[PDB]
C-alpha cells in the first residue's frame, strides 16, 4: 500500500466556471478564456478569473478613485473588472478612458460629457487583445458591511468587529464588558 498525503490529490478551491445562466456573461467569459489560454501575458488570464468571481468579489469602483489613479497614467486605458459608480462628492471630471463591467448611466453620461471613453470588454478585447499600455483596476474588497462584522469575537480583548446587534436602542449592548463600570471592559 502506498502512503499518500491528501490521498495523492490536488484539491485546490474556488470557482470552476460561471454559475450564472446569463447569456452575455457566459459568452464574454468564453471570449476571455480563449484570449487567456492563447495569449502569453498574465493580464488576460487575470481578467478572465476576475470576470468569473462572485458578486461580493464584483464590488463597484469609484469614478473618483479611478480618476485619482489615472492622473499618473495620463493617456492610458483603465480596465475595471467591476461596476463604475458616480460621485456626488466630486466637483468635475478630468477626462478618462474606462472599460468596465457595468456603467451607471449618470457616470457614463458624465464620462461622455467630459469627452472620455466608455469601453465594453468586447470592444477592449478588439482594440487591445495584448493588454499592452492598459491598466488593470479593481474596487475595495473589505469595504462591505458583512466584513465589518468579521474578525475577533465582540467583547474579547483588542477586538473591533461590529456586533450583530439586536436593535438600534440606547439601552442595549453598551453595558457588561463594553464599559468598565458594568462588570468589565474589552
Amino acid at each position: 500500500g502506498i502512503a499518500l498525503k491528501n490521498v495523492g490529490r490536488i484539491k485546490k478551491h474556488g470557482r470552476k466556471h460561471l454559475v450564472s445562466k446569463n447569456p452575455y456573461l457566459r459568452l464574454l467569459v468564453k471570449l476571455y478564456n480563449f484570449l487567456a489560454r492563447r495569449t502569453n501575458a498574465n493580464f488576460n488570464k487575470i481578467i478572465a478569473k476576475r470576470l468569473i468571481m462572485p458578486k461580493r468579489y464584483r464590488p463597484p469602483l469609484s469614478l473618483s478613485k479611478l480618476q485619482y489613479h489615472m492622473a499618473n497614467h495620463p493617456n492610458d486605458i483603465a480596465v475595471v473588472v467591476g461596476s463604475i459608480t458616480d460621485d456626488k462628492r466630486l466637483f468635475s471630471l478630468k477626462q478618462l478612458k474606462v472599460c468596465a463591467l457595468r456603467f451607471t448611466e449618470t457616470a457614463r453620461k458624465r464620462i461622455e460629457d467630459a469627452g472620455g471613453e466608455c469601453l465594453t470588454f468586447d470592444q477592449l478585447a478588439l482594440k487591445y487583445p495584448t493588454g499592452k499600455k492598459c491598466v488593470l483596476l479593481r474596487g475595495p474588497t473589505k469595504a462591505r458591511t458583512a466584513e465589518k462584522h468579521f474578525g475577533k469575537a465582540p467583547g474579547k480583548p483588542k477586538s473591533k468587529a461590529r456586533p450583530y446587534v439586536r436593535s438600534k436602542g440606547r439601552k442595549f449592548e453598551k453595558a457588561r464588558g463594553r464599559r468598565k463600570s458594568r462588570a468589565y471592559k474589552k
Partner: protein, 167 residues
C-alpha cells in the same frame, strides 16, 4: 558515496517520526527502492526507519539494470508531475538540460557515483516500484545483522542480489 535503500514493510501501524522520515525519504510504497547520498544526517534518518528497510551499496550492473528495466520519471510541471517510462532521452534532456545532464548514461553515472549533479537527477526520477523477490525471504521481520536468519538493515554489496531477485 551512495547507498540504495529498499523498503520492506506495510503502511499499517507506523510510528509518527517514522512516517515523517518515510515521507521525506519517498519510500511511500512497500517495495520502493531509492538512491541516497551518504551523509551523517541521511544515515541517522536511515537508522530511525531501519526495521522497515533493507539497504546497501548497489554496484554498476544493478544501477544500470534497474534504471533501464524499472526507470520511470516525473514528466509534468512543478508538483503537477506524471509517471512516464523513459524510453527516449529527449524528454529527460529537457528537464536536466539546465543542469547539463542530457542522457540516460549520464543519469546512470551520477546515480552510481554521487557527482556534481546528483540531487536533481535523483529527485526527478520516479521512486522505483519493485516486484516481490522471485524466491522470497528467510523471514521478513528479522535483521540481516541477526544470528537468527533475517533480512532488514544493511545488506551492503549483497543488496544487489536481492535487487536482481526482485526486479
Amino acid at each position: 558515496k551512495v547507498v540504495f535503500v529498499i523498503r520492506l514493510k506495510g503502511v499499517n501501524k507506523l510510528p509518527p517520526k517514522v512516517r515523517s522520515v518515510f515521507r521525506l525519504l519517498r519510500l511511500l510504497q512497500v517495495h520502493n527502492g531509492v538512491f541516497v547520498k551518504v551523509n551523517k544526517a541521511t544515515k541517522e534518518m536511515l537508522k530511525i526507519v531501519e526495521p522497515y528497510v533493507t539497504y546497501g551499496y548497489p554496484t554498476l550492473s544493478t544501477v544500470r539494470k534497474l534504471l533501464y528495466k524499472r526507470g520511470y520519471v516525473r514528466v509534468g510541471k512543478v508538483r503537477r508531475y506524471a509517471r512516464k517510462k523513459i524510453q527516449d532521452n529527449a524528454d529527460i534532456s529537457k528537464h536536466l538540460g539546465k543542469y547539463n545532464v542530457h542522457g540516460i548514461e549520464d543519469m546512470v553515472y551520477q546515480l552510481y557515483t554521487c557527482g556534481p549533479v546528483f540531487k536533481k537527477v535523483n529527485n526527478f526520477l520516479w521512486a522505483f516500484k519493485l516486484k516481490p523477490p522471485r524466491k522470497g525471504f528467510k523471514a521478513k521481520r528479522h535483521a540481516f545483522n541477526e544470528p537468527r536468519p533475517g533480512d532488514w538493515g544493511n545488506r551492503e554489496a549483497h543488496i544487489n542480489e536481492l535487487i536482481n531477485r526482485m526486479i
